[PDB]
């Protein structure tokens, strides 16, 4: 494994500056360069520039002069990309990539560092129990759910009866609308299990230090 | 001046032969380019280096079914016996040292879809709004979409069997085991929910459609 280890996801305010890190391991760091690439969500790749760890020499896409600063630390085998004067335009995945001094090929790439530039404010979810309409209660199994509505940011954790209900659970990644996340989880039990036995979803939101348990009642 | 023009996003049958085209700016007809492959949620991967004479070198982990050829300014990626794992966007890149500065440029990329993959048809779970959310004058409808492969779906909601496109948030597909899941939310007032006969969550998958409806009406 030749590897490039990037810093983790960042949620930053407009007008600030962030610093992403790219740690090389299992290759001679100073026998190669580090290049950085911008990707906006559902958009193509945009080349930012290249740092030569060995020389300190930098080359930049004109569009990023005054935006991106590239630095390298030989002793730690680490490349850094700082972004200044952040706006929503700067919201993107940033990749670091290895290339040679004399060739095009970005032959290995880091996992990516998601920089989100937002003034979204922290918000506890509204949790709602989902029972089926009478029509969806006539089956051999029954499916119940919980709606986790308008929270920020990720993540939340969801369990059913404190993790006592485990298989037949499907938890669906959040949609994002107007800087609020929404998600749902379902649990499928034998129709004999509910409503005779209690089913409650358990939702924790670490960011807001909140936990909500909602009992699923027949409608 | 340095421009890469990628051919139209195309659709190839499982096990068929695909040829993508990356065309160089005319003055840069002698240049070596790199192919890259970007699969969903994954960093781009180096595919090959491709020279003016058709000579290529493929990257780490690239099967012998990827080859290349050249004709003037045209740089071609050939995939024989296309496989589902080949489904991705293919992106060409080119370097030069212009105004005495190094620059790398990317093509816009070509979306390669593989038709005829093995298919698991989506399961839909639909929830009405909770009594509790209704009391708040609100009505989220929930469509949970699971057990599907490959990942490409579209989601459409109907009220009384006609299109409702306002207030819909739909997720991208994400992995769940050896398949995919997605979610869709339809945001309405409690009166819209009470004043319609039925709502429909309709999901298209690989020429198929699955619809699940629900009614505000008692049983």
């Amino acid at each position: 494994q030749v590897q490039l280890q990037q810093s983790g996801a960042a949620l930053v305010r407009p007008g600030t500056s962030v610093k992403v890190s790219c740690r090389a391991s299992e290759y001679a760091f100073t026998n190669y360069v580090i290049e950085w690439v911008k990707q906006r969500p559902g958009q193509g790749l945009e080349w930012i520039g290249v740092i030569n760890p060995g020389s300190g020499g930098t080359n930049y896409n004109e569009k990023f002069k005054g935006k991106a600063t590239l630095i390298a630390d030989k002793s730690s085998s680490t490349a850094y990309m700082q972004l200044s004067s952040l706006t929503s335009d700067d919201s993107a995945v940033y990749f670091c990539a290895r290339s040679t001094y004399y060739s095009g090929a970005l032959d290995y790439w880091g996992q990516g560092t998601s920089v989100t530039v937002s003034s979204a404010k922290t918000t506890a979810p509204s949790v709602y129990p989902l029972a089926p309409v009478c029509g969806d209660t006539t089956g051999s199994s029954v499916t119940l759910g919980c709606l986790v509505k308008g929270y920020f940011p990720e993540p939340v954790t969801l369990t059913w009866n404190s993790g006592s209900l485990s298989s037949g659970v499907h938890t669906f990644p959040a949609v994002l609308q107007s800087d609020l996340y929404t998600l749902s989880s379902s649990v499928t039990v034998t129709s004999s299990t509910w409503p005779s036995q209690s089913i409650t979803c358990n939702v924790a939101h670490p960011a807001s230090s909140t936990k909500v348990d909602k009992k699923i009642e027949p409608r | 001046q340095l421009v890469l023009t990628q051919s139209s996003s195309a659709s190839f049958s499982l096990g068929a032969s695909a040829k993508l085209t990356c065309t160089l700016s005319s003055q840069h007809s002698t240049y070596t380019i790199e192919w890259y492959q970007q699969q969903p949620l994954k960093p781009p991967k180096y595919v090959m280096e491709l020279k003016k004479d058709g000579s290529h070198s493929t990257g780490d982990g690239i099967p012998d079914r990827f080859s290349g050829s050249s004709s003037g300014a045209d740089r071609y990626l050939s995939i024989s016996n296309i496989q589902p794992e080949d489904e991705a966007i293919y992106i060409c890149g080119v370097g030069d040292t212009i105004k005495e500065q190094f620059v790398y440029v990317f093509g816009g990329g070509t979306k390669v879809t593989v038709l005829g993959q093995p298919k698991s048809t989506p399961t839909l779970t639909v929830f009405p709004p909770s009594s509790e959310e209704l009391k708040e004058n609100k009505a989220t409808l929930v469509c949970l979409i699971s057990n599907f492969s490959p990942s490409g779906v579209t989601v459409a909601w109907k009220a009384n069997g006609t299109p409702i496109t306002q207030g819909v948030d739909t997720s991208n597909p994400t992995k769940e085991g050896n398949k995919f899941m997605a979610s869709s939310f339809l945001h309405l007032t409690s009166d819209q929910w009470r004043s319609h006969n039925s709502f429909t969550c309709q999901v298209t998958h690989e020429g198929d459609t699955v619809e699940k409806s629900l009614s505000p009406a008692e049983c």
């Binding site: 004399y102 095009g104 | 030069d96």
Partner: peptide, 6 residues
């Protein structure tokens, strides 16, 4: 001709 020095 294509030149690459970084």
């Amino acid at each position: 001709v294509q030149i690459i020095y970084k």
